[PDB]
Nucleic acid binder design. Structure first.
Lengths: 367, 367
RNA sequence: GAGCCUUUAUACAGUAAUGUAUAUCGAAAAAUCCUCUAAUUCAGGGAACACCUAAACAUGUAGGCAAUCCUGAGCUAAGCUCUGCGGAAACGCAGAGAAAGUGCAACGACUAUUCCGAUAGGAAGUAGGGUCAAGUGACUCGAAAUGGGGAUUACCCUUCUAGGGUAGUGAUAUAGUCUGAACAUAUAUGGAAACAUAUAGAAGGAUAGGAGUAACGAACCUAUCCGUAACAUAAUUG
RNA sequence: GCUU
């Protein structure tokens, strides 16, 4: 139909792009991730990954365990590179763990929570867009974002399906041997069949997104590597055992590049020692009635000049080009901290919109 | 309603019989069990299972995975006691693993494979019922038999629920400490996620049966012992997990009577140090066009002059009483196989009808 | 809406009327009698209405409800066919089967009566219920095959008096009695909701016992769980 | 033409 018409039209567009990158005419979204520091580890030839990106209009996602009734800054890290991918035209999504929470990542009223979170996420996009169009970005039809909920399928997802479609492929070996969890049995109480299986699901999720949305990438927590790997395995397993001949033409690991890869953003902390996201005790929440807009503006303007550089490139949607401009201005007057007042205002916008974020500057820049 | 009064009828009688055992008048089903040597191991108190069988028309089943196109003579023994219970007036079942086959018990097309067994169990049951009334057995309203496919439910069993309804109380520790496993990892190969779950499955199955009919007792192969244990585990957590309380009022283990016990038949192997089912050129099946009636008949007519005894108790619904009589004629002439004919015939007749029982004996009676 | 037959069309089927198949159609229908009504459970899969809901997903969907199409296990009244024994006959017993019914009523419970009528129904007051009394009393309702099996009939066909075929679905509840069914409810689990399931609802109600009986019942005695919030209400609906 |  006419719908398929625009689809193929997009392919070409994405090729003029794949071209520019070929002759370094435009940076590779991947080398963009290296330019702001979003790469800690990689489950997929750092290089390969790159090509897979310059080339195809791939997709990715970021999962969030709806355990808290609000996300905190610590989640903003991994969502950034996603966002960027979005700004380029890829297919990005944010998977909510509505069901997974019920088990929880064994790394080491529930509705009410799950609910809030959803909305909390859409809001961001609502701003990422406003931001995207504003900071000078072009309208791409094919471009694709969205919010999913692992429950959507897991709620009825029969076990026979899973246990068979992949159960024969995995082996408790590189599972029970997994340090993160294995360590839990030794140095801990132990583990519930749920926990042991949690990964397995995290992998059925990745696949679901591939099978249901063409996802060849997953961005996650620094500690989520051990998971991103195990997921992978599960991903493929299903693609392999596709008992459908006409559907094998899809899912089955065709071309070499047709491989799902991922990358764990780095684990950050404050110039001192306190882990990132936490503050004295709790954390830098996002929920206004739990972290006033002011306080928010605070933990950001707080960061000293030692990190402002590395952390400025991490949480702002600003061309490193213009970044060094703000930084080169700040360094000629560290005391006044022009760079700290700006970086803070910038991130408060994205999450809390300009209108407020601007007023919030008045408070903290007053007296 | 009338139907109501009916269930009550059989109920009352059950107490009359509960008394006979209480005042020595009829062997408690379970005594007839350990007596005819059907028992080798037990999960629950020897007296526990006793009392329960005195005051409860409990339900019990025998699991059978359709991995082969025919039930081999081995599958008899385990079923045998079951049949007896049906005879005494219980709730007995035979479970078909039409889905668990893609997994199988770990220890060390296919669609029709199952079909074959279906038709089987049936026809068999028929004769069981047949011989029953055939020999002074008064039917009972409450006495019921039946077969049930395991896919019956697995076909669409929600992963989420399951995992929760029991995973939150199961540790992969002891679940992996079962030797059956440790070996299937150290020695030999490895243990997949799938097969790892078989123990849980067979456990759930039980739960089902306990729910859909009132089956609170498993009867498995001499080796299936472990499963009988790992299974019972899932069983408990299940009756607890039940969300709606009102239901819990029934489904949850209230008094010590609502205790589900399971026992395992012995390991019966021929005087050939080989399972009593993996002998001959490969095995000894029931399928006529896979094991000549004659050849079958033989498997019995020829057996240890000593074995006859305990072999009659295990494969013939012959009253202990005249069972010894057969031993009277036999000993007057060891090499005459007087008892071997009677014990051989029984088996054939049971799994092949009287008409054949004779026809076979004839061939095995020539010059 | 859906099914039945029905108009016509083709199609595989036959000795042929006719048979099965899809679609179209509606122009008149759609024989009688007798006998059986037991079992009444455990799941499973699908579904027209446009019929409520709208949390997701980009009105499209989706979940619910549902006329209702079925499958597995078990069970079942009188017959049915194969084989074995009995018989003179019947039928009997045995086993192998082949229909068919529960399952598959508005959540269910319960019953297969006479008379008259072209029917709808009318009269009986049986079957079996409801209410009040307390005792074997009053009062008030009040009735089904539309299936299974066996006959008879008429019909036309005929490889033409001997076979063959045609004489509709309707019971996933029909009659009818009840009714926790009916509540946009209360409650509790499950859902975002619509809902589904379980109790309960004009302080009582429910089940399991004690006693006592000729037996059931009223009333007593024990325990138990439900409410103790307003509606349940009378037509009316399966 | 009838039917739940």
């Amino acid at each position: 139909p006419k719908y398929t018409a625009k689809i193929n039209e997009a392919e070409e567009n994405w090729q003029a792009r794949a071209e520019a990158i070929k002759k370094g005419k435009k940076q590779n979204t991947w080398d963009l991730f290296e330019e702001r520091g979003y790469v800690k580890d990689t489950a997929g030839t750092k290089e390969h990954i790159a090509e897979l990106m310059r080339t195809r209009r791939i997709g990715a996602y970021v999962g969030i365990d709806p355990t808290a009734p609000s996300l905190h800054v610590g989640h903003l890290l991994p969502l950034m590179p996603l966002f960027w991918m979005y700004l380029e035209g890829y297919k990005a999504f944010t998977l909510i763990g509505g069901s997974t929470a019920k088990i929880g990542d064994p790394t080491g009223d529930a509705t009410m929570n799950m609910t809030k979170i959803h909305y909390q996420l859409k809001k961001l996009w609502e701003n990422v867009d406003t931001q995207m169009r504003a900071r000078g970005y072009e309208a791409d039809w094919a471009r694709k974002r969205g919010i999913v909920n692992n429950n959507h399928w897991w709620n009825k997802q029969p076990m026979l399906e899973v246990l068979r479609r992949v159960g024969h492929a995995l082996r408790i070996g590189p599972m029970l041997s997994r340090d993160t969890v294995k360590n839990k049995m030794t140095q801990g109480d132990g583990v519930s069949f749920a926990e042991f299986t949690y990964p397995i699901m995290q992998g059925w999720d990745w696949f679901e997104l591939f099978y249901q949305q063409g996802v060849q990438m997953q961005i996650g927590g620094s500690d989520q590597y051990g998971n991103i790997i195990s997921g992978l395995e599960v991903v493929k397993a299903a693609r392999e055992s596709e008992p459908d001949p006409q559907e094998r033409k899809y899912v089955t690991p065709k071309t070499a590049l047709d491989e799902c890869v991922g990358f764990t953003v780095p684990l950050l902390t404050d110039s001192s020692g306190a882990k990132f996201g936490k503050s004295a005790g709790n954390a830098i929440w996002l929920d206004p009635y739990q972290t006033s807009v002011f306080d928010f503006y605070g933990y950001f303007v707080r960061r000293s000049d030692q990190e402002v550089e590395n952390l400025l490139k991490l949480f702002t949607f600003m061309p490193i080009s213009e970044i060094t401009k703000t930084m080169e201005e700040h360094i000629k007057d560290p005391s006044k901290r022009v760079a700290q007042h700006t970086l803070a205002r910038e991130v408060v916008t994205l999450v809390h919109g300009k209108q407020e974020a601007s007023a919030a500057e008045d408070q903290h820049r007053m007296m």
